[PDB]
Design a protein around this ligand. Structure first.
Ligand SMILES: *[C@@H]1O[C@H](CO)[C@@H](O[C@@H]2O[C@H](CO)[C@@H](O[C@@H]3O[C@H](CO[C@H]4O[C@H](CO)[C@@H](O)[C@H](O)[C@@H]4O)[C@@H](O)[C@H](O[C@H]4O[C@H](CO)[C@@H](O)[C@H](O)[C@@H]4O)[C@@H]3O)[C@H](O)[C@H]2NC(C)=O)[C@H](O)[C@H]1NC(C)=O
Ligand SMILES: *[C@@H]1O[C@H](CO)[C@@H](O[C@@H]2O[C@H](CO)[C@@H](O[C@@H]3O[C@H](CO[C@H]4O[C@H](CO)[C@@H](O)[C@H](O)[C@@H]4O)[C@@H](O)[C@H](O[C@H]4O[C@H](CO)[C@@H](O)[C@H](O)[C@@H]4O)[C@@H]3O)[C@H](O)[C@H]2NC(C)=O)[C@H](O)[C@H]1NC(C)=O
Ligand SMILES: *[C@@H]1O[C@H](CO)[C@@H](O[C@@H]2O[C@H](CO)[C@@H](O[C@@H]3O[C@H](CO[C@H]4O[C@H](CO)[C@@H](O)[C@H](O)[C@@H]4O)[C@@H](O)[C@H](O[C@H]4O[C@H](CO)[C@@H](O)[C@H](O)[C@@H]4O)[C@@H]3O)[C@H](O)[C@H]2NC(C)=O)[C@H](O)[C@H]1NC(C)=O
Ligand SMILES: *[C@@H]1O[C@H](CO)[C@@H](O[C@@H]2O[C@H](CO)[C@@H](O[C@@H]3O[C@H](CO[C@H]4O[C@H](CO)[C@@H](O)[C@H](O)[C@@H]4O)[C@@H](O)[C@H](O[C@H]4O[C@H](CO)[C@@H](O)[C@H](O)[C@@H]4O)[C@@H]3O)[C@H](O)[C@H]2NC(C)=O)[C@H](O)[C@H]1NC(C)=O
Ligand SMILES: *[C@@H]1O[C@H](CO)[C@@H](O)[C@H](O)[C@H]1NC(C)=O
Ligand SMILES: *[C@@H]1O[C@H](CO)[C@@H](O)[C@H](O)[C@H]1NC(C)=O
Ligand SMILES: *[C@@H]1O[C@H](CO)[C@@H](O)[C@H](O)[C@H]1NC(C)=O
Ligand SMILES: *[C@@H]1O[C@H](CO)[C@@H](O)[C@H](O)[C@H]1NC(C)=O
Ligand SMILES: *[C@@H]1O[C@H](CO)[C@@H](O)[C@H](O)[C@H]1NC(C)=O
Ligand SMILES: CCCCCCCCCC
Ligand SMILES: CCCCCCCCCC
Ligand SMILES: NCCc1c[nH]cn1
Ligand SMILES: NCCc1c[nH]cn1
Ligand SMILES: NCCc1c[nH]cn1
Ligand SMILES: [Cl-]
Ligand SMILES: [Cl-]
Ligand SMILES: [Cl-]
Ligand SMILES: [Cl-]
Ligand SMILES: [Cl-]
Lengths: 337, 337, 337, 337, 337
């Protein structure tokens, strides 16, 4: 009688679980059970190009109605201990593209079960998942990436279970509060569809983010050092051509440093067989510093027989190299922006 | 009768657990159960800027009263085996910002259950948790960071469970005994509040530390080597301008070393798109060593036609460069301290 | 009576499991139970030469008939909760060459049980496995590798269990959708056989892939830098022989850089005792840059007494070195392609 | 009757566990139960300064008497299967300073239960534990460290459980067989005491080792290369002062190499804010190589106007630098040894 | 009656387990139970000098007779589901020197139980174990190592359990099929003995391998680069002594490169306090390249006053250095081979 009478509540819950078969889905043999899903994204831990995946922490909630759990006489929503979920049927929801995922278990399993008088079940889970995201690094680091989270039922087909985003476009929250130092989230989308396999058609929910990579880190880390090395190679043009050791040292160091910058950057990224946007810039800067050393090799070859021509080549190189490199940056930054 | 009669104690404990429903919170359907929490911080293992998190080991204790566990006739507090916690209701306490946490289980699960005659339950857990802490590295390494530990109930709302710091300002102990080689704990605070979500309002407890980074390591590791390289570039000012190979070698090595110091440091830290305080110093030192090499390029360009002017430029550079760099350090250390 | 009557379904399932002995295989003491297997390959995460293994994620399905589970009166296929698999006999299938494998367990264990009226059981598992693959790196990076997945019964011999690929050549799907940045899957094969051990003959299923390594990454990372360094060493041939510091610096840097490229590459790969294809190219490039420095050591030795002969040696070296190195690349790329 | 009659033994063991309450400690409500502990140290896996911890593998044995397990008629010690420990009360022993620990479980859980006729229980566990050890690196690598293992009861106070080292000074064995390549174990001590907390006074057992770091590795790795670089800088004193490129190159390389040695070593160690003993030596060697380069900068500045004075400075530097550096090593090695 | 009658088989197995006490070993209170062990080594994953351990994957089989499991009327060997092992007594076998081990559990636990009419039990486990192996690196990389796997009973003494290698010298198979890229298995041995501890005497089985390290990798990685650098230092002997910058650059680079090779190699290996065989070679090569630079420092010191003597020193150095270094290799390779 009394909702505050725990003895009466215990009798009501025991009656619900008496004869309850966890092996059978709600409305077994009849219409499919509709499962509504909402996601509260706590954070996106990291985005890795090397492993081609991202780490996501979220509050995963499932909404469905089980008539076997309908109770009367208690005008309240029953929030039970999370351990009761082992005595109830739950959807076999799994993430299609996940690589490693777990449910937090401190201090207890991060799980929620809330019952409703009509038999509606609220099932919440705090899950940290690492989901695979293949990335196209051709325009890297000025690339825009699209990473998805695929939600699907494992065993039950569309004849048994149906998926939908509960709340429509507002089913997923917390996207605007995600703080990625390297990326900005341009847009997120929700997709519901059915995928046909050899064992039947299965419900599918898709959550996708469009990530825009910030360029600030790469300007300070790769682009500026490459520019400084290229400018450093131009110093030899003002050095006297009789200083063979000095000018060759400028040519050697700038050429070798440019190669080390190019190779070191590729080591950090995964072994991809195509040229990236930054690789085009680094290889472009290598030509300028290589031609600067070849410029002195030409001057050193003829400065004895033709000192006048050698001086003109040095004088013209002081203008052509800064001018050509400025144009190279102009065409480069217009293409990739 | 006799408290030392184990048969009588076994009967008393069995009576408490007879008809006990773990699925129901204490005072189910009535006033919310108040849970008091205390933390004994054993240590802070590490603070990582790369992962933006810190590792914490602590003794987590929860205090609440369950009238179903009230016993009479035994004027003693019953300290039971930790395995009895699986037969009792416990709060669904979880850490909001934790990334990976566990309860120690050697030799047994690091868990404590102590009962009281009125039904009060003491529940202790030794937990090592890695909690996310977003850090602002703009003033790094002279930055001050604020890392928090958020405590919240997962399933139960404020209508069912209430949180409070047991003992007020003294609820958290062991803060002054924390030994961080890189940080000093300026202050810790305790905050109690209620947070409203889509599923209701939830109790919240917040433990926050203000960490001040020690500068001793970075002086020896980054600042001093940068100063020594800048002073090294000034050696060329006293070298004769006819030593083209020697002075250019001093210019090349100091400029290249400065770039390697700048890029290597940024690799250790996470890829952030903004300039840090140390980055300002390293880029400032790069200009001084770059101008030192450009100084000889100017001297080498005119020392043949105008030897007198070239000697004066070398002589003035011996004073201006140490003076300007001293001023640069003065303005730098006043801004960030 | 009614298939949609959950009470009738619960009675039918309880009858099947009443007296069911999980310790006994189907048709125990009689003909061996035939298990059909299909694999839906979700992805191949990575291929590691250092660890000599690859990571595979797949949908592993087992097909067999158990007459103890045959039911009548329900003209439907019973898709039960995955937790019922703990109450049924399943084959002791294990992967012979796996190093670390697991079944995904979010949100539930990634497991499927589907029953059929005749007693046929469909048992699906989503497994991520790391399987050992010994690789022959003699032709690396132009090598072609053959990695296998060996499927075998652990305890039961061919007298008790038999394996076969269900669907023949189409038993394994998703191979053409595998995206390896470094490898291309030339062909996959399915092999069924029996392997004799000391404890008897055991069924065996083999899934093998032939992987062709893409050469695009290694051209940009190793081959091109080696070519550029070799061309860099040729610059000294046009430098005047009186520039002893400049030409020796070109010889030193190219020789030292070539050694660093060779040693660094071998560190990434596992410690193998044989020479690889790339090692042959790197050691070939080392000879060219070493002879270039020895060329000046010969010129510097005689340019005082015999300036005319020294000039001819420099002039001839400008032709022989590019010509010989071009031939070296011709014979090299014909041998390994 | 017959000890070899397994049916009689099974009846005796079942009688012991009939009515046995694992939730109650032996002599509950009476005198505290005394637990004797012995440790057989299998090995010390590693000692890490970076993580400030060490890894320990040991055989952990607990000795206590439970009158509920006393049996008569069998004049033998009952060695039972390790799975019976789940049906018995065991002390809630945990390691206070451990960071990650586990009990080995191959092929079974590495656990031992041996019963005695009077009710004495022998409980053995093979545990690998990583225990935190704060280290003072001011005298590193000539430092002596003291790492402890703290043993304490988690829930029970001194009113319920008491700890003591069984066998006194011989409670811990295997210390002399520990093989640490980098450390030598000078001495180990055993301490028994009671620690008072907010929840009461708890028994404490402490096992501490005094570790002396071997200096052989650091002589070959850091000290000798630093000496060789310092001697290398002295070569310029015998080089003619007109060789500006050669002597400056000797000065540049020795100074730059010394900085790289200093910075690289600090990266391996944890970020501590104080100067270590090795840091004093490396910074001392930096001054000698820096003054050597400044010595030529002084000679190069005056060798034209005052060639006689410049020659004397070179001649005196050939004696003062080896003599002063020898004295620097003398005072250094006397202070830290 | 009928062996193919599963109902009769189920009755027979239930009778065996009725009244079966897992807490009691077979023949409890009587003669010790003899356990025969065989190992089928699948692979040796890796051998690590840094961690002083090796990883082993094997099929571990235990053979013993339990009269409580003897059955009659079924003339067949009963291969039961692996889950029946939890209802049977098994030996408490553990590996003494293991550091981390596990039993594979995909798709089921890699476990086998086979019964025999007389009560003999076959118990198989597929175990991957990392066992500690202390290594003597004094002759590294030409060292020969002896790594063992120690098998012992944890709780039961020799009065209760006895170990023996089933099949004698053929108890361990698959040794000849082990493929270690860096090592060759010279010989394996089997040892059976009893070890006395404080708690009694325990059975012990030892499997030991003698590993011979292949030298092919280290010739290409360390020995050849050291030889090439030493030969590189000899180039300065043919360079004119007036080329001070060139010859000092050859001396500086060879000396610095030799130090980097020596220090980098020691970093990969564990921090041991003794000199290795390769360390002797690297330090020997350092002297040759250091004396080569000191050779020019002597020539540069006297080539002005005594040009004739300086030319002879260069001429003699062209012969003595190759001759002495050839002898150094002769004595070195004879000592360590
Ligand atoms: C690291 O950064 C975090 C986040 O910024 C800081 O956490 C904040 O700490 C401050 C205190 O320093 C908190 O402010 C206090 O909040 C209490 C709780 O507010 C709840 O309840 C009130 C009603 O009582 C509601 O209005 C409110 O919405 C909340 O539901 C208040 O009770 C406190 O009030 C006290 O101060 C006011 C004046 O400001 C007085 O009028 C009151 O009488 C009383 O004395 C106070 O406002 C703040 O809420 C925390 N934020 C979060 C997000 O937790 C950490 O402090 C910081 N770490 C360090 C070391 O500085
Ligand atoms: C990676 O490397 C592995 C190992 O080398 C390759 O695996 C081999 O694949 C070949 C097929 O390409 C296998 O050869 C086939 O074996 C079948 C099974 O043999 C069992 O049964 C027969 C009796 O039927 C016994 O005699 C035998 O001992 C085994 O018990 C055969 O049925 C096949 O026969 C077919 O070809 C023959 C002619 O060769 C015809 O006469 C037959 O009619 C029939 O068409 C065949 O012999 C071989 O067994 C595999 N080896 C292993 C160890 O598994 C992978 O193919 C390779 N990967 C790639 C991509 O190439
Ligand atoms: C690494 O560093 C740790 C921490 O510093 C060292 O641990 C200390 O070890 C010393 C012994 O070397 C300990 O001192 C001894 O403590 C015993 C326990 O004290 C408890 O009980 C007494 C009453 O009996 C109380 O007063 C006290 O508060 C404690 O509750 C004492 O029984 C010992 O007494 C002995 O010496 C005194 C004289 O000093 C005599 O009068 C006594 O008769 C008796 O012989 C002693 O005081 C100390 O407690 C340890 N500290 C901690 C924190 O554990 C390690 O030793 C060190 N490792 C190495 C290798 O040196
Ligand atoms: C790696 O390194 C380990 C450790 O050094 C080596 O292991 C040793 O291997 C040798 C054999 O090569 C072992 O020696 C043998 O021990 C057997 C067991 O001894 C027990 O039983 C005897 C009584 O029977 C007791 O006296 C003893 O204390 C032990 O309790 C003996 O039965 C063997 O005897 C054989 O040789 C003797 C002559 O030496 C004959 O008289 C006998 O008839 C018989 O033929 C033998 O002594 C030694 O015990 C092992 N040590 C350990 C610690 O296990 C590995 O061999 C090595 N690996 C490789 C590849 O070399
Ligand atoms: C609470 O409910 C139980 C079960 O229906 C009932 O027996 C008991 O009387 C109720 N309590 C009161 C105060 O009526
Ligand atoms: C201990 O309590 C039990 C249960 O109440 C009782 O039967 C027994 O007699 C008591 N012991 C004594 C010595 O009275
Ligand atoms: C459903 O099946 C049960 C068990 O056979 C039966 O008792 C019940 O009457 C059936 N339902 C209907 C509506 O007939
Ligand atoms: C062994 O003990 C049981 C239980 O007491 C008893 O029934 C049986 O007769 C004993 N065995 C013999 C041979 O007496
Ligand atoms: C199989 O064995 C059971 C148990 O003994 C028996 O009841 C049954 O009749 C047997 N089957 C046949 C066909 O006899
Ligand atoms: C790359 C910039 C070099 C600037 C040299 C300036 C020389 C000026 C001589 C009048
Ligand atoms: C390795 C390419 C070197 C090119 C030098 C060109 C010099 C031309 C002088 C006329
Ligand atoms: N399935 C055979 C397992 C095995 C191999 N060796 C020993 N046992
Ligand atoms: N054994 C005492 C555990 C503890 C410390 N602080 C709180 N609980
Ligand atoms: N099997 C013996 C285990 C052991 C060693 N030391 C203590 N216990
Ligand atoms: Cl967690
Ligand atoms: Cl732990
Ligand atoms: Cl997972
Ligand atoms: Cl283990
Ligand atoms: Cl596994």
């Amino acid at each position: 009688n009394d909702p505050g009478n725990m003895s009466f509540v215990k009798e009501t819950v025991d009656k619900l679980l008496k004869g309850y078969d966890i092996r059978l889905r709600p409305d077994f043999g009849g219409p499919p059970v509709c499962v509504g899903m909402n996601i509260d994204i706590a954070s996106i831990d990291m985005v890795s190009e090397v492993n081609m995946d991202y780490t996501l922490t979220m509050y995963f909630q499932q909404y469905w109605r089980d008539k076997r759990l309908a109770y009367s006489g208690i005008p309240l929503n029953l929030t039970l201990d999370n351990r009761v979920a082992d005595q109830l049927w739950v959807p076999d929801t799994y993430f299609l593209n996940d690589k490693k995922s777990f449910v937090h278990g401190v201090t207890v399993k991060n799980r929620m079960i809330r019952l409703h008088p009509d038999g509606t079940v609220l099932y919440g889970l705090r899950i940290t998942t690492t989901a695979a995201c293949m990335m196209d690094l051709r325009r890297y680091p000025l690339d825009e990436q699209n990473c998805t989270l695929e939600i699907e039922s494992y065993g039950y087909t569309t004849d048994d279970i149906e998926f939908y985003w509960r709340g429509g476009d507002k089913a997923v929250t917390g996207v605007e509060r995600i703080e990625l130092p390297q990326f900005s989230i341009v847009e997120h989308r929700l997709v519901s569809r059915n995928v046909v396999f050899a064992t039947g058609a299965y419900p599918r929910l898709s959550l996708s983010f469009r990530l825009k990579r910030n360029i600030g880190y790469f300007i300070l880390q790769t682009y500026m050092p490459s520019i400084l090395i290229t400018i450093l190679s131009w110093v030899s043009f003002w050095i006297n051509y009789d200083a063979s050791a000095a000018r060759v040292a400028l040519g050697i160091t700038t050429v070798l440093t440019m190669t080390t910058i190019n190779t070191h950057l590729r080591e950090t990224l995964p072994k991809i067989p195509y040229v990236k946007a930054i690789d085009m810039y680094l290889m472009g800067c290598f030509v300028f510093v290589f031609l600067a050393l070849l410029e002195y090799a030409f001057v050193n070859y003829i400065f004895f027989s033709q000192p006048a021509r050698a001086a003109a080549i040095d004088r013209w190189s002081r203008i052509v190299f800064p001018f050509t490199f400025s144009l190279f940056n102009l065409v480069y930054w217009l293409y990739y922006v």
